[PDB]
RNA sequence: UGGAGAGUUUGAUCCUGGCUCAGGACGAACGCUGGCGGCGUGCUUAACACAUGCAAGUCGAACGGAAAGGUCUCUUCGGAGAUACUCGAGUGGCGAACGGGUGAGUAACACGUGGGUGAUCUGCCCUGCACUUCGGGAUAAGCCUGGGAAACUGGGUCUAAUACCGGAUAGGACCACGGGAUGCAUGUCUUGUGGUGGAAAGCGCUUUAGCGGUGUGGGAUGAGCCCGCGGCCUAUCAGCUUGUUGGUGGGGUGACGGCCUACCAAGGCGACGACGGGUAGCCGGCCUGAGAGGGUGUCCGGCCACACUGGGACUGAGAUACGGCCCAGACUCCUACGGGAGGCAGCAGUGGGGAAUAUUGCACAAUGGGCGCAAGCCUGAUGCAGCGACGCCGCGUGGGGGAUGACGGCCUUCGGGUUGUAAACCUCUUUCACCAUCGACGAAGGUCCGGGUUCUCUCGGAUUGACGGUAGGUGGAGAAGAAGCACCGGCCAACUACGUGCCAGCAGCCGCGGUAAUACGUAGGGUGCGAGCGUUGUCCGGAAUUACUGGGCGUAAAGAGCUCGUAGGUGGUUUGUCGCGUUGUUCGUGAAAUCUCACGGCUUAACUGUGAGCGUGCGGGCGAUACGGGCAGACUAGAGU
C-alpha cells in the first residue's frame, strides 16, 4: 500500500477475518450436530442440543459475526425442525 | 468603441440633418462620395436599413448595444417603436443633451465619460447608465468654475427642455419626472421601420 | 449526521449564502434537504434571516448545526430559546433606514422653489 | 404579444418540384489585425503510455512506553536520571465507502416521473426507559537472535488497555397456546402465561474541569428491493427459451423472490416487433423555431457506471474499495537470477495523437468535510491568482468651433467634381492607460488575555486576509500612449478608372473573363460592422421539401390486376345504469440553478439576490353525465333472409 494507515487496516483485516472465521466454523458444526440427532429422530438430545445451538447463533451475533435478522432465521428453522420429530 | 469620424458625412447618406443645425449640410443635402448625386433605387430594405442608421448615429450606439435595446423593446409590453425609443431616451448622455448642458452629442457623450457627473452621489463614468424615475442627476462638486460647464449657463434659453425633466437653478442639477412616452421625444425618423428592420 | 450548514451561491467576489440543511456526506452545492435561511455577509451589518419556526424542528430532531451556523442562531435567538438560555429575544440589528427615492424627489424641488 | 422571402427548367407563361443563399448558435479551428477592464470558460481525438512533487489522516482526556525538543537533576565535559508537561515508531478507537476525476460499458428499472415496502436495513446525531456486574489468558512494541541481494520474514523471552475471550442478571431473539384492536390475501401492531436465550469500559480533574460504555421503545437522515407510464435506428434479424414459466419441502439473504437445490406439473414470451444486429451514459437543461416539433446532453446541479484488462472475496453501519488485499494476463523497472516493485480517467505537468485546448502557482483567511473535550492538526474539496480576444458585456483611441471650401491622390464632358469640417489652425476636457500617494469590504468570526451569576455575554483591547499594496478614492502632466477587417452584378446595404484578353484567375447558386469587365488584379471612392472582422466544419430555421398543428395521388413522383377474409381501426335510432376516457375543484408532488415577469445590489451592463409565474404531467379525496366507451334491455330506416 501507499498511505500510512492503509497498512494499518491490512494488518487489522486479517486478525478481523481469522478472528470471524472461526466463530462461522463453530456455528456449522453445531446446527449440523442438532441435524444428525433431529434426524435420527431422537427427541432426547434433540431437545437440548437446541437449547445449546441457539445459544451460541445468539452470542455470534452479539459479536458482530453474523447479522441478528440472521440469527432469528435459523433459530426459527431449526426449532421448527423439533416440532415436527 | 466610437465612431470617431466625421459627423457630416452621416447626415448626408440619411438624406437627414442628425446634429442640431448644420452648414455644411443643406449646401450638399445629397449622399458623399463620388458618385454622390446619381439616382438611388428605393428599395423596402433600404428605407428599412437606413431608419435603422438614423437611430444609431444620432444617439452614437454601435450595433450589439442598439441590438440588446431591441431584445427588450419587443420583450415589454405597450408597442415596440415606443419603448425603443424610450430606453434610448433615458440614456444619460441623452439626459445631458435634453438638459441644456452640452452643444452637441459627441460632447455629452465625454462630459459623462470623463466623470463630471453623479446621480445620487454616485460617480457615474458610463454612458449607457438608464436613469429611472425620481433620479437626480448632479454635477461633480470639483467640475464647476469650469470651461464647458460655464459655458452651459448662459446659454439655458435657445434649445427647447422636454417636459419629463426640469432643470433647476444654481445648482445645475436636473429631476427626472418620467420615462418620456412619444410626445416630448424629437422626431427626424419615424419608428415603425426599425421594427420591421429585424424581422427579416 | 444531519448538519445545517451554509451553501456558497454567490458571484466571485460576492459570496452570498444559504442557511440549508443537509447531510455531512454532502458537498456544499448539493441537495438541501431543506432550505430555512440566507445569509448575506457583505451589507453593513448583515443581512440575516432564519425562518425560526423551522430552525426549531430540525433543532429538536438532531441537527448538529455547524460553528459558523451556531453563531447565527444565537444572534437571531432561535439557539436560546431551544437550550433554555434568557437571551431568548434576538439581538440581531437591521441596517440604518435610508430615505426613500419619493423623499429625496421631494427634498429637491421644495429646495428650488 | 406572435409566422417576411430571393435566384434558377422555357422564346415566353402558369403549376409541380429539387438544388442554393440571406438569419441565429458554438467547449471551437484557421486567416489578417490587436488597447483595456468586468465575468464566464478552456484535451470534443488515444478509457493511449506516464518521469517528479503533492491529493487522508487524526487523538497522550484508550494503553505500554521514552527515539526528538523543553525542564528537574548527578555531573563526564559531552554521559547518566519516565519520576516529568510534550512526543518518533507501535497497539487500540473512529475516519479512510465522503470529497475529487472520467464517459469505456449499459437499450437495462440505468434514467425521468408517480407509487408500493403487511418484504427491509440505517454508524455518528436527538429523545424516552433500564443498566454500567464478577473473572481469565495472551500479544504488538521493547530486548536477544536466525534466514534473504533486496522487498521482507521465522523463532525465543517480555508488557499493557476502551484489544481479545469466558460467567451472573436484563422481553422487543426463537417456539407453543391465548386475549384485545384493526384489513389488502400472505397478515400487521399491541398485550398475557409457560418453555428457551443474548450485553459493556473505563479515563480525566486548578477540586459544580469533564468526555465516554451497553441493551432497548421512538424520531431524523441515508440506502436497498419491486411495479405503472415515458424517451433511439433496423424485419435484407421470424421462432426464442429447459432453472426456462409455475408449485411444494428445504437451503440462502438485511429483505421478497428459481436467488440456489431436489422432485413434480408443461409451461413463459412474440407481428402492440420476442430473439438478434448498429449506436448511445440518462436527466434538469442548452441551441433553433411563431408555436408544434427538430438537433444536442458541453459549464453548473441530480443520478448511474468504471479506476492498467478480466474475475474474486475480505474488513465494516455503509464497498465499482481510484491513491486496499489475493490470483491470472499485457506492459514498464530493480536483481546477487532464488525472487521482487508499479498503475495520474485526483491537482499541476511531460511524451504521443491531433485542425485544437493552459501553471510542475498561492492560501487554509472564508465556506464544507475527517478526527479530538478542546487549543489545534489534516484537506490540489474549496477560495483565488497565472495563461489563451475562446465567448458574452462595458469603455476608450478625443471634443466645440473651423473655408481661401488648401496641398496631395483619384475622376473629368478639362468649366470642375470628390475625398471634405475631414485635415491645417485656434481652443476645451483627462475617462482609461502612465507617475506619485492613501488604502479596503469579504470577519456582528478565529484565537488569546480584562469585565462575566455557570451555560451565555458584552464595556473594550492585543492580534488574525491567500487574493494585495489589488479594487477604489485623491494629486500630477499634456491630444497626449491606442484601428482594423470583410464586402461593393442580382439575392443584399455599397461604382468608377486603369492593367488583363477564355489567359491569369473568380464563385454559395446561375454565371463572369474571347481588346472599352460596375463580377478577375490594383488604386480612388463607398457600404456594413468595429477590438474585432471574415472563411471552413456542425445543428435548427427559411423547407407547408415527412405536412399532428400543416401536403398529396385522372395526365406532374404516387390507387395494389381484381376480389375474399384474420388480427386491428370504425359504427345507425332509443331507455336505464356504472363514472374507465372527458371535465370541474382541492391537498401531496413537479429540488436548486437556467428561463419569462417585478423590484433590489455590484459606477452601468453582463453577472447576482429575493418574490411570483412556469413545471403541458402524475398520484389520493370529493362533484358533473352532454359525448366516447363498458354492462343489462328495447326498436326497424343500414345489413341479411
Ligand atoms: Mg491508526
Ligand atoms: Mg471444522
Ligand atoms: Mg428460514
Ligand atoms: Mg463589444
Ligand atoms: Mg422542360
Ligand atoms: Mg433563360
Ligand atoms: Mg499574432
Ligand atoms: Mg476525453
Ligand atoms: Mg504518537
Ligand atoms: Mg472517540
Ligand atoms: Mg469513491
Ligand atoms: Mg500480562
Ligand atoms: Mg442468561
Ligand atoms: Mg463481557
Ligand atoms: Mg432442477
Ligand atoms: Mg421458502
Ligand atoms: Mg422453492
Ligand atoms: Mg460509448
Ligand atoms: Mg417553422
Ligand atoms: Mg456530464
Ligand atoms: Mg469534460
Ligand atoms: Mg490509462
Ligand atoms: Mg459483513
Ligand atoms: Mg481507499
Ligand atoms: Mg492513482
Ligand atoms: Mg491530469
Ligand atoms: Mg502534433
Ligand atoms: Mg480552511
Ligand atoms: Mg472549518
Ligand atoms: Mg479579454
Ligand atoms: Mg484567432
Ligand atoms: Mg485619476
Ligand atoms: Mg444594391
Ligand atoms: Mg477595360
Ligand atoms: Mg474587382
Ligand atoms: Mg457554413
Ligand atoms: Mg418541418
Ligand atoms: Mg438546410
Ligand atoms: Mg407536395
Ligand atoms: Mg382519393
Ligand atoms: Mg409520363
Ligand atoms: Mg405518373
Ligand atoms: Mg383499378
Ligand atoms: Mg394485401
Ligand atoms: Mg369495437
Ligand atoms: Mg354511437
Ligand atoms: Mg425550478
Ligand atoms: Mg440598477
Ligand atoms: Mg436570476
Ligand atoms: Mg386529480
Redesign the pocket.
Known amino acids: 500500500?501507499?498511505?500510512?494507515?492503509?497498512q494499518?487496516?491490512?494488518?487489522?483485516?486479517e486478525?478481523?477475518?481469522l478472528?470471524?472465521?472461526a466463530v462461522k466454523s463453530s456455528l456449522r458444526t453445531a446446527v449440523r450436530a442438532f441435524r444428525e440427532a433431529a434426524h435420527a429422530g431422537d427427541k432426547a438430545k434433540a431437545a437440548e442440543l437446541l437449547?445449546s445451538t441457539?445459544?451460541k447463533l445468539?452470542?455470534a451475533?452479539?459479536?458482530?459475526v453474523?447479522?441478528?435478522?440472521?440469527?432469528?432465521?435459523?433459530?426459527?428453522?431449526l426449532?421448527?425442525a423439533l416440532?415436527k420429530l | 468603441?466610437?465612431?470617431?469620424?466625421?459627423?457630416?458625412?452621416k447626415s448626408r447618406?440619411l438624406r437627414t440633418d442628425l446634429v442640431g443645425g448644420d452648414?455644411?449640410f443643406e449646401?450638399?443635402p445629397y449622399?458623399?462620395?463620388?458618385?454622390?448625386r446619381?439616382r438611388?433605387?428605393e428599395?423596402?430594405?433600404?428605407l428599412?436599413?437606413?431608419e435603422?442608421?438614423k437611430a444609431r448615429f444620432t444617439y452614437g450606439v454601435?450595433?450589439?448595444?442598439f441590438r440588446?435595446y431591441y431584445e427588450?423593446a419587443?420583450?415589454?409590453?405597450g408597442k415596440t417603436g415606443e419603448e425603443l425609443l424610450k430606453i434610448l431616451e433615458s440614456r444619460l448622455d441623452n439626459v445631458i443633451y435634453r438638459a441644456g448642458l452640452a452643444?452637441?452629442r459627441?460632447?455629452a457623450?465625454?462630459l459623462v465619460?470623463?466623470?463630471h457627473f453623479n446621480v445620487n452621489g454616485?460617480?457615474?463614468?458610463?454612458?449607457?447608465?438608464?436613469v429611472?424615475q425620481y433620479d437626480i442627476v448632479d454635477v461633480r462638486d470639483?467640475?464647476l468654475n469650469?470651461?464647458?460647464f460655464q459655458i452651459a449657463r448662459e446659454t439655458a434659453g435657445e434649445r427647447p427642455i422636454p417636459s419629463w425633466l426640469q432643470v433647476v437653478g444654481e445648482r445645475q442639477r436636473v429631476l427626472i419626472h418620467q420615462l418620456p412616452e412619444r410626445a416630448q421625444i424629437d422626431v427626424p425618423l419615424t419608428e415603425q421601420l426599425i421594427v420591421?428592420?429585424y424581422?427579416? | 449526521?444531519?448538519?445545517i450548514?451554509?451553501?456558497?451561491?454567490?458571484?466571485?467576489?460576492?459570496?452570498?449564502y444559504?442557511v440549508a440543511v443537509a447531510?455531512?456526506?454532502?458537498?456544499?452545492?448539493?441537495?438541501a434537504?431543506e432550505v430555512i435561511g440566507?445569509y448575506?455577509?457583505?451589507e453593513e451589518?448583515?443581512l440575516?434571516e432564519i425562518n425560526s419556526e423551522r430552525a426549531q424542528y430540525w433543532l429538536?430532531?438532531?441537527?448538529?448545526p455547524?460553528?459558523?451556523?451556531l453563531?447565527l442562531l444565537?444572534?437571531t435567538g432561535d439557539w436560546?430559546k431551544f437550550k433554555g438560555?434568557?437571551?431568548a429575544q434576538g439581538?440581531?440589528?437591521v441596517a440604518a433606514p435610508k430615505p426613500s427615492?419619493l423623499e429625496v424627489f421631494n427634498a429637491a424641488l421644495a429646495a428650488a422653489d
Do not use: C
Open positions: 500500500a501507499n498511505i500510512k494507515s492503509q494499518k487496516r491490512n494488518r487489522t483485516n486478525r478481523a477475518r478472528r470471524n472465521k437449547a441457539n445459544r445468539d452470542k451475533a452479539s459479536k458482530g453474523i447479522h441478528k435478522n440472521q440469527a432469528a432465521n435459523k433459530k426459527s428453522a426449532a421448527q416440532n | 468603441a466610437r465612431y470617431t469620424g466625421p459627423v457630416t458625412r447618406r452648414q455644411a449646401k450638399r449622399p458623399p462620395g463620388q458618385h454622390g446619381a438611388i433605387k428599395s423596402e430594405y433600404l428599412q436599413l437606413q435603422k442608421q454601435m450595433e450589439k448595444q440588446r427588450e419587443v420583450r415589454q409590453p452643444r452637441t459627441r460632447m457623450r465625454q465619460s470623463h466623470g454616485v460617480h457615474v463614468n458610463v454612458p449607457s447608465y438608464r429611472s470639483k467640475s469650469t470651461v464647458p420591421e428592420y424581422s427579416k | 449526521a444531519v448538519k450548514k451554509l451553501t456558497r451561491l454567490g458571484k466571485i467576489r460576492n459570496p452570498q444559504r447531510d455531512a456526506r454532502t458537498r456544499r452545492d448539493g441537495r434537504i440566507r448575506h455577509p457583505k451589518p448583515s440575516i429538536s430532531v438532531g441537527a448538529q455547524t460553528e459558523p451556523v453563531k444565537k444572534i436560546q438560555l434568557p437571551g439581538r440581531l440589528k427615492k
